[PDB]
Amino acid sequence: SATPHLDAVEQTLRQVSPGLEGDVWERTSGNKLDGSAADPSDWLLQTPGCWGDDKCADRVGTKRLLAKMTENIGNATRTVDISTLAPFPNGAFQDAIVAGLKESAAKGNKLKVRILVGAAPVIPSKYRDELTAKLGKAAENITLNVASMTTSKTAFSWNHSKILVVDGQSALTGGINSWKDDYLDTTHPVSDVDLALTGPAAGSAGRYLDTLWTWTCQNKSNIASVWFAASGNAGCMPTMHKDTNPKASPATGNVPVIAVGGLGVGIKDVDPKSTFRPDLPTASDTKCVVGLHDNTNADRDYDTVNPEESALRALVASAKGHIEISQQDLNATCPPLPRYDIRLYDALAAKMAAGVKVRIVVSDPANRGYSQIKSLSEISDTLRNRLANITGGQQAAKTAMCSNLQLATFRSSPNGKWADGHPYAQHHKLVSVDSSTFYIGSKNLYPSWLQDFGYIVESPEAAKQLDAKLLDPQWKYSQETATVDYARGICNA
């Protein structure tokens, strides 16, 4: 096959969540990574994009991100569909949205617009009002829905997806919250990444948002769950995408993609079509407390409505050669979450045991918002213990780990910290395998029970672009913090 990695992932998803195929996950063909003619890699919307400079003077990544948001929105003829994590977009993120809506309205277009945020159980009516004011005359052309939502207080579940879909044709998604203080007006900007694509896979994002809004609209009268606000006398629009855009978006290229999300907890309890029978592993050091119900490691029905967890574990399991992971964290704070995803660590262990190389770059523990560990040993100890189950013991585990692991914290320049003295915060949710297939989205690899979304793309060209523009510069600067680095014989773990 031309797509051995997506083929494997797809086969897993059809066993895990068959009743969600089309809505919460979907394989499509005919997509394009949406880069410029001058710089074809600039579909990769990294931020800040200031490699080598501890002052972050020339933020070529931020500039391109904000420009691309406005470009895509400004090309709208029918719909604009946005999700993110609260707070609502502010600063130049909000400026970019407003500029795009005005651009589209001046071209004579009448738009439907949804903006959904997940929140701890902010104020939609105020954001609607702020936006309507800033739109000016353009607001005459726009039907707006704005909502904040919480799906489960006790499982800590709410939207965490960060999506911008225009006309079902273009989509930007990734880890980037639209938070000016963390990303923009700061001399220690968070490092993160979105991608830009067009094609049928953008339609997949639209159908995922219809799923979230269908729940949101159904619960709009429940005060503990949803705060909703619309323009004019407009109603809640649960199926804006299905109602307004083609069931299949137009093809724009030849890139194959799996779109995959999750429903968290409190939307749907199980996929009743699923006959998934997982082999669930055991461990004594993930569930820190006996009271905790562990959805990540011990709830079959949870997996069936959260295909993304399985998709990420299958993407790791597909690797023949090498895996690069860039995350805020691999481990979560317990309670209320378990410390780690056993199956994911077991998948990484299986790969190292077979000589497949694994690089994990996480955020510096000095950030502990943007870190949940005290030391890289909380990751290496765990990988070692899981390797021990399949290599015959602790010594042979340590050897397999030291021979096949790169483990480090993130820097973007020679300096251990930004020049203002703040540690580098990293927030990517990135996995790449074999210079071939990669995930960019909102789903963290640490235990998390939220609504999330992302794309798995099988395109060696784009993955090599990803290498050049992001992973290579990352490892250039980050390798100096490594506790384990097989490429240099370092093994301080």
Ligand X SMILES: *P(O)(O)(O)OC[C@@H](COC(=O)CCC)OC(=O)CCC
From the list 70, 177, 204, 304, which residue makes contact with ligand X (rule: CB under 6 A)?
177
For residue 87, the 8-state DSSP code is S
User: What backbone phi and psi angles, to 5 degrees, belong to 409?
Assistant: -105, 155
As a whole number of angstroms, the distance between CA 82 and CA 3 comes to: 30
Which residue from 305, 128, 130, 153 is spatially nearest to 222, judged by alpha carbons? 153
Q: Are 156 and 334 in contact (CB under 8 A)?
A: no
381 included as an active-site residue: no
427 included as an active-site residue: yes
104 touches ligand X (CB under 6 A): no
Angle at 40 between CA 34 and CA 46, to 5 degrees: 75
For residue 191, the 8-state DSSP code is B
CA end-to-end span of the chain, whole Å?
A: 39
448 touches ligand X (CB under 6 A): yes
From the list 106, 120, 122, 487, which residue makes contact with ligand X (rule: CB under 6 A)?
120
Q: Which is nearer to ligand X, 175 or 454 (CB)?
A: 175
- Catalytic residue of the set 42, 81, 182, 192: 192
What minimum distance in Å lies between the beta carbon of 9 and ligand X? 22
DSSP string, 281-316: ---SSS--STT---TTTS-HHHHHT-HHHHHHHHHH
In three-state secondary structure terms, 58 is coil
Residues between 41 and 100 with contacts to ligand X, criterion CB under 6 A:
85
What minimum distance in Å lies between the beta carbon of 146 and ligand X? 17
The percent helix, strand, coil of the chain (3-state, each to 5) is: 35, 20, 40
Q: Which is nearer to ligand X, 109 or 444 (CB)?
A: 444
CA 296, 299, 302, 303 dihedral sign is: positive
Encode 236-270: b = buried (16+ Cβ within 10 Å), e = exposed: bbbebbeebbeeebeebeebbbbbbbbbbbbbbeb
What minimum distance in Å lies between the beta carbon of 447 and ligand X? 9
- Catalytic residue of the set 42, 452, 467, 485: 452
Q: Which is nearer to ligand X, 180 or 242 (CB)?
A: 180
444 touches ligand X (CB under 6 A): yes
- Catalytic residue of the set 5, 188, 241, 427: 427
452 included as an active-site residue: yes
* Residues 180-199: x where in contact with ligand X by CB under 6 A, - otherwise, as a string: --------------------
- Catalytic residue of the set 160, 188, 241, 428: 160
* Residues 402-441: x where in contact with ligand X by CB under 6 A, - otherwise, as a string: -------------------------x--------------
> Which residues lie closer than 8 Å to 461 by C-beta, 6 or more apart?
none
From the list 68, 112, 160, 287, which residue makes contact with ligand X (rule: CB under 6 A)?
160
5 included as an active-site residue: no
Q: Which is nearer to ligand X, 12 or 157 (CB)?
A: 157
Annotated catalytic sites, by residue? 160, 192, 427, 452
Residues at the contact surface with ligand X, assessed by CB under 6 A = 85, 120, 156, 160, 175, 177, 427, 444, 448
